[PDB]
Design an enzyme around this catalytic site. Structure first.
Site, PDB file in Angstrom:
ATOM      1  CG  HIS A  14      -1.998  -1.036   1.171  1.00  0.00           C
ATOM      2  ND1 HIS A  14      -3.298  -0.906   0.850  1.00  0.00           N
ATOM      3  CD2 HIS A  14      -1.861  -2.459   1.359  1.00  0.00           C
ATOM      4  CE1 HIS A  14      -3.862  -2.098   1.143  1.00  0.00           C
ATOM      5  NE2 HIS A  14      -2.994  -3.009   1.377  1.00  0.00           N
ATOM      6  CG  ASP A 113      -5.126   1.897   1.282  1.00  0.00           C
ATOM      7  OD1 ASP A 113      -6.063   1.313   0.694  1.00  0.00           O
ATOM      8  OD2 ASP A 113      -3.990   1.594   1.316  1.00  0.00           O
TER       9      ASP A 113
END
Ligand SMILES: C[C@H](CO)OC[C@@H](C)OC[C@@H](C)OC[C@@H](C)OC[C@@H](C)OC[C@H](C)OC[C@@H](C)O
Ligand SMILES: O=c1ccn([C@@H]2O[C@H](COP(=O)(O)OP(=O)(O)O)[C@@H](O)[C@H]2O)c(=O)[nH]1
Ligand SMILES: O=c1ccn([C@@H]2O[C@H](COP(=O)(O)OP(=O)(O)O)[C@@H](O)[C@H]2O)c(=O)[nH]1
Lengths: 431, 431
Positions: A14, A113
């Site tokens: 990520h 996110d």
């Protein structure tokens, strides 16, 4: 100058996607605050060139700390999987520090996110617009949302069938999916996603319908660079072209001893050259079958812990990628034209592997009806794709896909920038 | 914002290199005025992505016009070679309009080409600092300067020897004096389109000889993302990989019938696939041997006027480049990994071919003692390099050179930006 604070989830993959997106925004004259925990910031700093440091500054997020769960464990990277609940819980408790950071830095936009529902809430409280950015592809999300609306009709634009090993606390599973979908649903006007229309366009349109929200692709997002490469390149330099597979399962998974044995024997029976990164959990070689490295001889190399994946995948001697099909690894392999031999493990990976197979740029090693990896299937696919190259169709499609992705320039970010521009202009009025 | 007016020479290859350099500078937040004649600005506009038009503005330079030498002839592109003296004279007569442009736009910096000694003087008279940018490589310039200082010693860092066809008057001195003045007059540094892996020792030699710092601004290579390509692509999509040679002699040269006959006959004897760009002077097929095309059949293609050179060179079915060895075509071929079969014609091309040969990324078809192209050498080199790949050393080094050049990024411009920043800070004080 317009400032954006970016908050990835605490995984290395990520961080990676978020950093490539930060580079793209910095090139459009945005100033970026890149916010994560210090162990993650240290891990990703080598991927940020020095020319960017003036416009992409790192901002440390503090998680609660104890000697049993100290800062160097505030990441999924090599985390014992039984600490994953602790990591999620600790991340949710960083919300007040996050609010302190947002109050102090007062960024004009937040990009966050999909594992932190609290993040757009803190941004709303401070009158800061927030956009969700997803580092997975589209296929998995659309596959997750489809049965919620169509529980008796099959997913309508793919022939993919999820093996029963992955189909197999119902309220807790529901609460996790509700948190995940909230992050997307809560996004201001659009959701961003690391994908591109040639591969997933129709899934993008389908997801946009189910969500009743525009889906904006920003992919391909692919990082391109001795961290140990000099020794690896010297060994690769002595191989024939397209003769070697890279073998890796990403940043947050440790294959079991039985799984390592099927892969190892798969590699052996294929007689391929291979570079295989074997990792061990932070606290904790002998994960491999007896005599495997010795029998392999000059054909095999095991790197411990971490390897320069991009450089290995770009080497002329690399003909395949035995991958867990993490999304960054898949995008990377496609960008570099290396066909994937899919050995997915969990979360979005079985879907990614099916998407790879369906696009024709790689193959998937199927698990047996018990859900076990099959050394015969691994050895067979490496033989066809890499050693004997009878799957000329897959190698051609992989080449054609790399040419497509190589042709993409900064225009891939135009749509994101315009939606950011519109969003800020609307909210400036309302504030 | 810091502003830079860029003045290329009136050739298409000079326009191209200057435009790539303008893009690099735009990405560093400079505002560019791109100055040339309207026929050149029209010719180069398709190479400028729309995202740059806000920071790269085209500015028309007016040359004296006549019914016998109208605006559409104010360029070397397809110009009758007997009009080249008129073009230089007309260019020098634009200095007043150039001064008017400079007075009006008041740029902070001039970057000028090496065929306009009047340009730095106009800048100096308006207290505008000016830097010379050379679109050739370094080899030719250092080979031109060396015998001025060492008339009885061999060029020290190469084995290259110039064929007598090109070795063969104070007027030549006056042109050499004007060229060297453009470099010598440059403020602090000279910019040049090259890179140290190929020409570093020649850069250092040139810097000593000129007593001025030489700053490489790297592989400058335009990459697009229909211009007749779909038909060419469909044709190319049906060939074998690395089966075809592109054939082109650039923007400002018409090979003679004798040269065209030798090249065509070399092409036919090799039985390679070929796309061949054939041109005729602006005012005005008949230049090829009788029945050459019909005997070639579907293996040959002649494109009239202009071709998408980069797209053709990047195609998987292109295995070689029969090139006059213009420097832009050399840089492009090297970036795309296509070995060169050198057929240089005049100006800096024989030197560029020698450097190509020296590097091992290409071969040179040698001329006869009287200067005649040899059909047998053209055919022999295409046979060895493209058709039957027996010169794998060239292919490999062509691939290795492309791997070096593909690894370069924005850092190739750091030294130029730093010198610009210093020069403007020094002259800011002095003005
Ligand atoms: C005239 C310049 C004045 O700056 O220097 C002349 C002198 C120092 O000669 C040095 C030597 C290099 O000259 C050789 C000469 C053959 O080249 C002159 C050039 C005009 O052609
Ligand atoms: O030895 C390794 C293993 C992984 N990676 C990089 O780590 C990232 C892994 O992301 P992915 O989405 O593939 O899977 P995850 O780690 O999230 O499970 C990718 O950029 C890989 O290139 C690497 O550089 N070296
Ligand atoms: O049919 C053609 C011929 C040339 N070019 C481009 O024109 C430029 C020629 O520059 P070069 O230095 O090679 O030769 P010159 O024209 O200056 O003699 C290069 O960018 C070529 O790619 C092109 O696009 N199409």
């Amino acid at each position: 100058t317009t400032t954006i604070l970016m908050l990835p989830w605490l995984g290395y993959g990520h961080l990676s996607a978020f950093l490539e997106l930060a580079k793209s925004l910095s090139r459009r004259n945005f100033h970026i605050y890149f916010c994560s925990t210090s162990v993650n910031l240290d891990a990703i700093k080598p991927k940020l060139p020095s020319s960017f440091s003036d416009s992409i500054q790192f901002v440390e997020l503090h998680l609660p700390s104890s000697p049993e769960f100290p800062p160097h464990l505030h990441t999924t990277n090599g985390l014992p999987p039984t600490l994953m609940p602790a990591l999620h819980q600790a991340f949710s408790m960083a919300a007040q520090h996050f609010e302190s950071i947002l109050q102090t830095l007062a960024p004009h936009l937040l990009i966050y996110d999909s594992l932190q529902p609290w993040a757009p809430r803190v941004a709303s409280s401070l009158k800061i617009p927030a956009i969700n950015f997803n580092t997975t592809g589209v296929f998995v999300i659309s596959q997750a949302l489809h049965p919620i609306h169509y529980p008796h009709s099959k997913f309508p634009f793919s022939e993919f069938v999820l093996h029963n090993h992955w189909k197999a606390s119902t309220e807790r599973t529901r609460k996790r999916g509700e948190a995940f979908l909230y992050c997307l649903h809560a996004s201001c006007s659009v959701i961003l996603i690391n994908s591109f229309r040639e591969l997933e366009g129709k899934y993008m349109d389908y997801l946009s319908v189910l969500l009743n929200k525009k889906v904006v692709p920003v992919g391909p997002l692919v990082y391109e660079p001795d961290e140990g490469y000099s020794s690896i390149k010297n060994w690769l330099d002595k191989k024939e072209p397209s003769s070697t597979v890279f073998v890796s399962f990403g940043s947050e998974y440790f294959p079991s001893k039985e799984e390592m044995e099927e892969i190892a024997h798969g590699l052996e029976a294929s007689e391929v050259n291979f570079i295989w990164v074997v990792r061990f959990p932070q606290g904790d070689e002998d994960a491999l079958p007896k005599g495997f490295l010795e029998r392999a001889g000059e054909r095999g190399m095991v790197v411990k812990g971490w390897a320069p994946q991009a450089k290995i995948l770009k080497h002329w001697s690399t003909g395949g990628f035995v991958s867990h099909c993490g999304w960054n690894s898949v995008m990377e392999s496609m960008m570099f034209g290396v066909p994937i031999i899919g050995v997915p493990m969990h979360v979005d990976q079985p879907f990614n592997a099916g998407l790879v197979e369906e696009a024709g740029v790689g193959v998937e090693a199927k698990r047996d009806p018990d859900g076990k990896i099959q050394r015969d299937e691994v050895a067979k696919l490496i033989k066809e794709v890499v050693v004997e190259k009878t799957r000329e169709d897959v190698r051609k499609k992989a080449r054609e896909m790399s040419e497509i992705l190589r042709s993409k320039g900064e225009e891939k970010f135009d749509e994101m920038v315009a939606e950011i521009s519109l969003l800020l202009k609307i909210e400036h009025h309302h504030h």
